[PDB]
Design an enzyme around this catalytic site. Sequence first.
Site, short mmCIF file in Angstrom:
data_model
loop_
_atom_site.label_atom_id
_atom_site.label_comp_id
_atom_site.label_asym_id
_atom_site.label_seq_id
_atom_site.Cartn_x
_atom_site.Cartn_y
_atom_site.Cartn_z
N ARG A 107 0.85 -1.18 0.00
CA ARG A 107 0.00 0.00 0.00
C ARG A 107 0.89 1.24 0.00
O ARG A 107 0.46 2.31 -0.44
CB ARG A 107 -0.99 -0.01 1.17
CG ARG A 107 -0.34 0.07 2.55
CD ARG A 107 -1.29 0.01 3.73
NE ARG A 107 -0.59 -0.33 4.96
CZ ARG A 107 -0.38 -1.56 5.41
NH1 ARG A 107 -0.84 -2.60 4.74
NH2 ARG A 107 0.24 -1.74 6.57
N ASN A 108 2.13 1.08 0.46
CA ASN A 108 3.00 2.20 0.81
C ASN A 108 4.13 2.36 -0.20
O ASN A 108 5.18 2.91 0.13
CB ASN A 108 3.54 2.06 2.23
CG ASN A 108 2.53 2.41 3.30
OD1 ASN A 108 1.67 3.26 3.09
ND2 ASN A 108 2.64 1.77 4.45
C1 LIG Z 1 -2.54 2.15 -2.24
C2 LIG Z 1 -3.43 3.36 -2.09
C3 LIG Z 1 -2.88 4.54 -2.78
O1 LIG Z 1 -1.84 5.07 -2.39
N1 LIG Z 1 -3.68 4.90 -3.83
C4 LIG Z 1 -3.47 6.02 -4.66
C5 LIG Z 1 -2.31 6.77 -4.53
C6 LIG Z 1 -2.06 7.87 -5.32
N2 LIG Z 1 -0.91 8.69 -5.29
C7 LIG Z 1 -0.15 9.11 -4.18
N3 LIG Z 1 0.91 9.89 -4.41
C8 LIG Z 1 1.63 10.29 -3.36
C9 LIG Z 1 1.34 9.94 -2.06
C10 LIG Z 1 0.23 9.14 -1.93
C11 LIG Z 1 -0.24 8.67 -0.66
C12 LIG Z 1 0.55 8.62 0.47
N4 LIG Z 1 -0.22 8.12 1.48
C13 LIG Z 1 0.25 7.92 2.83
C14 LIG Z 1 -1.48 7.83 1.03
C15 LIG Z 1 -2.57 7.31 1.69
C16 LIG Z 1 -3.74 7.12 0.98
C17 LIG Z 1 -3.80 7.45 -0.36
C18 LIG Z 1 -2.70 7.97 -1.00
C19 LIG Z 1 -1.52 8.17 -0.30
N5 LIG Z 1 -0.51 8.73 -2.96
C20 LIG Z 1 -3.02 8.19 -6.25
O2 LIG Z 1 -2.81 9.29 -7.06
C21 LIG Z 1 -2.73 8.77 -8.37
C22 LIG Z 1 -4.18 7.46 -6.38
C23 LIG Z 1 -4.44 6.36 -5.60
N6 LIG Z 1 -5.67 5.68 -5.83
C24 LIG Z 1 -5.90 5.52 -7.25
C25 LIG Z 1 -5.83 4.44 -5.10
C26 LIG Z 1 -7.12 4.42 -4.32
N7 LIG Z 1 -6.88 3.75 -3.05
C27 LIG Z 1 -7.54 4.52 -2.01
C28 LIG Z 1 -7.53 2.45 -3.06
#
Ligand SMILES: *CCC(=O)Nc1cc(Nc2nccc(-c3cn(C)c4ccccc34)n2)c(OC)cc1N(C)CCN(C)C
Length: 283
Positions: free
Chosen positions: A140-141
């Site tokens: 996830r990270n």
């Molecule tokens: C795995 C879930 C996820 O990260 N999903 C997405 C991430 C995107 N981009 C992005 N870019 C930089 C930082 C983060 C980020 C950092 N942390 C701690 C987050 C927590 C939750 C969500 C994002 C986080 N993320 C992104 O932009 C393209 C989209 C997603 N979506 C598409 C996934 C949806 N997910 C909730 C299931």
Amino acid sequence: ALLRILKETEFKKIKVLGSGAFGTVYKGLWIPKVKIPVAIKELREATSPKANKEILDEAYVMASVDNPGNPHVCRLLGICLTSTVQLITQLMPFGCLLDYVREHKDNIGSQYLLNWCVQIAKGMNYLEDRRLVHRDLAARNVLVKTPQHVKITDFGLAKLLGAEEKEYHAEGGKVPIKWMALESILHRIYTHQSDVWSYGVTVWELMTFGSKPYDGIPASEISSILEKGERLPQPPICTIDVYMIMRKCWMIDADSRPKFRELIIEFSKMARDPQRYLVIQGD
Ligand SMILES: *CCC(=O)Nc1cc(Nc2nccc(-c3cn(C)c4ccccc34)n2)c(OC)cc1N(C)CCN(C)C
């Protein structure tokens, strides 16, 4: 160790990306000639002095490894002061690698997975040189900038080891059990070697294309299972050699666990011959 405080006004917080227990992440544009796409994080109950302390902790931990950095470790862009503290970080457009390995489960060749594992070991090895224990290495990270570019993120739990400190003593909050090393669950001790196990698991996540580890087993029974000597299964796609690595990350003797330096060497070695090591359908 520098923070860049950015002006609340220059952001136009477009939409949400995904909310957790811990907090809520928003995508949005930052317009100080070009416009920059960014991600914005603020914690749950963002008024509380506990939830403003932890976010500025995250910002600290993050900023004191900014220089020089590593292309596999997200950088803070700064923080916004509104009514709360917001953490700004450049938007990875392909989202987390867990989500990815699911959506695109049928079009990922060996050369990608095996490159990602090296990129992640590279991310983590630098961190280790920076005396930082990520404490939450997962799929996830792991953000995907492009299919050849993956970066580590989320320093909520991340901590810095003192000059002579070897391990970290967690005043147990809420931790992700099915990613933790044995000694992390029993005694709440976290190490670079505890991040190795987390890696091991994250590896397993990718190889299985985003299977939930120890599926439908309650959190409780986990430590038990592990003490029996039960580990996650060998994924269908993996040969023994790749699984033998995962199985080293999960050994009780944390100091018999491989090092991030050793991992980069191993996964590069495999990543050079990707089909010899991973049997994907139609690869
Ligand atoms: C795995 C879930 C996820 O990260 N999903 C997405 C991430 C995107 N981009 C992005 N870019 C930089 C930082 C983060 C980020 C950092 N942390 C701690 C987050 C927590 C939750 C969500 C994002 C986080 N993320 C992104 O932009 C393209 C989209 C997603 N979506 C598409 C996934 C949806 N997910 C909730 C299931």
